[PDB]
């Protein structure tokens, strides 16, 4: 349809893509997790596999437009390949991430973006004691791989992981799940790097479907 | 041949591709499933693997042509990469979908499209009790990942899953399989999203071929 | 090299690619299978894994040239991606096909093409009884995914599957294997679709002292 | 922003890419390892799986700029695909490396580059005796695949592998881990080749988190 | 530096790529193997996994240059994607080959090319008896997939497989390894095809690393 095609052409076909954030022009990315399933634990390797949706939000001036000039369009869907996306990376993964959903973002006229890819990830986690009442706790940090806090900052809208889509008949049940902004330093570099620490306490489900 | 070459050049060379549906120009996608095989169950991870053909139909004004101007061509096969396709997604997969067939669509002169890829998918399903007379029931929802009901609506032509190509010597026999349109909300967003709920009841095959 | 470079340039840079067959201009694809190895059976999922070569042949007028104009070149090898290839698909696979060879076709001056990829495929097959004298029978159909018999017809040169390269120390011995043209229908469409039915009878190979 | 866009355009859009080092113009690559986890040992195949971050540094004249001409920009992040990178290779791997992080480098105005990809690698290692107090030692060499020491020299900044991020609840604990420059020869060619020898001594962890 | 950029531009930016050999202009490809490890045997499927480096050499007139015109450059490294490469294929593989090294070749001013990728391959091999003194023998043939002996003449410089980099603590020790040229015919075609037969006799390693 005509106005949207016009908008996309104007946004994407007449300027260099945004070169990412800088010290002079930093960016804050909002992160939120929807934990869908703990699929698998491996006690011989201390890896656990999660399926989650990773909600990402940020805003770029270069993605702004006046809806009046585009038939009142206030937002649109577009392939995530058409726009800059933050290098938010799980820091304790053991396998490359597996993408389970289309990668398509929603862009709004004020230059804000929402992007929520579904992912399966194997990560470092010792599941010893998962078949007990107390269960086990594991944690996983997410943050920019390459940008320090001087270029990319992070925040969560809530410290409570969204569990409203958690698979009720998973082999594992969630005792608690939080997502908390933290600061980290790595050996390579003097500067502070921001992460969101996903902390999940869980155990083998012993009630519900399959259990009598 | 010559006329088809002209038609494909005229449709695919001279205009921007359809930017997807919008609130002002929504799209209805028709879905239907042909369930070919339940291949595997995993009771240590509560994952089940299906092979199915997913029939998708939709119509675009931008894909219309006058057959009179193209040697009376009324339809053609074309690579799915050549056209917009809907982002219909299984919401409870645990691995990336595996495509088992070419991805080629049929486009008709009225702009309607038929596209039927074969896929293998692992999804969240507790198979406990599958080896019993009563079997087990699992459900899997399919819908747009990024578009609400305001942009993409779904429908089925029948609520019965097509079982006429179901593998007769599968480990698992199908007791029932339905596909039903429904409405869902996710935490990220306040708008209604539409899905098709695929509900399959099954058990270990204990009769037929290989059972004397 | 020079003559061949000119031929490939002239064939592939001057006109749109063949858009595939139509009712007005159908195409017949010849298929033949060489079974190399039954690698694995899985009795917990009823899947069997085969390694085979699939010989495909067809002919397109748009691939014709006069050898006199190209230093008497009568055929050439080229990447299969440079030409149209038919969408011949195993209908009962359970995993994406794994290609084990380069995908390069031979094109002949009369427009005929030969293309023989090596593939490993997992497919739907109940292996119960494979460890018995009678063994087991499994079948796999191959045909176009999207074209009916009005656009793509199939044929074989023989109904005898080529077993001359079958791995002799396989876990499984082949009793027989046939490849036969058939007509099939599927729910989506009312038109006849053509396939080649590959039927393999096999059993465990237990005897062998190297 | 504007100045960075100018800089990237100038560096990347007007000259052929650096064609790699030569005898006349050799390059020294500094290497360092951050060992994050020994994930798995396979005693039936003598393969061991590591997760590590591989820190690579080098300097090119062609990547220099005057910060004064570019709004006082002194460094920037850019996709590793935008620049030449060294073909540093694990010589005893048994599976293709799996990349676990974005591949983005930092380029500084003096032409220096820092690139630190996270990787999972299976390599040749006999883990017999890992379950004892003395543990086992394995070695893995890293070097250019195709350049001799006439074109690529290697250096470490320290002979101590960085263990500050080692996963505390790994199945395996590290007894020692060193990284040492060496000079090796291969049958194909007569020239001196340079490697970095990663030597890890480790055993099954039987103390700490998960142990009471 | 400057001279190499000139050379690569001159070689790669003006003429069509070599279209492969023909009967009128056949090509000799020299093959040699460096056997690094027998990683795994599978007695359930009769597959064995090897790691080897496959040394390939051939010469093209179109890759020649006068060193005098290019600052005395007599050879250079270049991505294998920049040049034509022969379709040398393992004939009894059971999985797609996995590449373990960069794919970069060395081109010399006389037009000759050296290219040595490291690979892991699963192939057809019955390992029954590998745990004995006499061990077991398996053979794997390599040759062009599509070119007969009239287009590609395969040669070896030696029938001795290079064992100088064989992993000393492999599960399997090598008793002998030879590489032998032979003529094959395939049912499809009347022409002779040339292959190299890699024949490896091996057994379970019962002495070496530890083996106290
Ligand atoms: N993410 C930890 C390593 C790291 C910090 N800053 C970086 C910049 C570039 C890079 O490739 C890697 C890094
Ligand atoms: N499908 C669930 C998440 C979701 C809803 N709307 C979306 C829009 C864009 C996106 O990447 C993701 C979403
Ligand atoms: N490599 C055995 C089959 C074979 C012989 N010649 C060929 C030519 C093309 C092709 O795809 C395959 C072949
Ligand atoms: N091959 C079975 C499904 C089928 C028949 N005709 C088709 C046309 C297009 C398509 O995507 C799929 C089909
Ligand atoms: N060091 C691995 C073998 C080797 C040495 N020099 C090389 C040059 C090119 C190549 O592909 C491979 C090599």
Offer a few descriptive terms:
binds serotonin, Acetylcholine Binding Protein, Chain: A, part of a larger assembly, mainly beta, 5 chains, receptor, 8-stranded mixed sheet, 212 residues, 4-stranded antiparallel sheet, 12 strands, pentameric ligand-gated ion channel, soluble acetylcholine receptor
Question: Which structural class best describes the helix and strand composition of chain A?
Answer: mainly beta
Instruction: Give the beta-strand count of chain A.
Output: 12
Q: Judging from the principal axes of the Cα atoms, what is the shape of chain A?
A: globular
Largest two-chain interface: A-B, 39 and 30 residues
| H/E element sequence of chain A | HEEEEEEEEEEEE
Oligomeric nature of the chains: part of a larger assembly
Counting structural domains of chain A, the number is: 1
Round the Cα radius of gyration of chain A to an integer and report it.
20 Å
Helix % of chain A is under 10%
Strand content of chain A: over 45%
Q: Give the C-level CATH assignment of chain A.
A: Mainly Beta
Total of helices of chain A? 1
Bound molecules: serotonin
CATH topology description of chain A: Acetylcholine Binding Protein, Chain: A
User: What is the second-level CATH architecture of chain A?
Assistant: Distorted Sandwich
Report how far the terminal alpha carbons of chain A are from each other: 56 Å
The CATH superfamily name of chain A is: Neurotransmitter-gated ion-channel ligand-binding domain
Main pleated sheet of chain A: 8 strands, mixed
PDB class: receptor
Keywords: receptor, pentameric ligand-gated ion channel
Entry title: Crystal structure of a mutant binding protein (5HTBP-AChBP) in complex with serotonin (5-hydroxytryptamine)
Chains A, B, C, D, E: soluble acetylcholine receptor
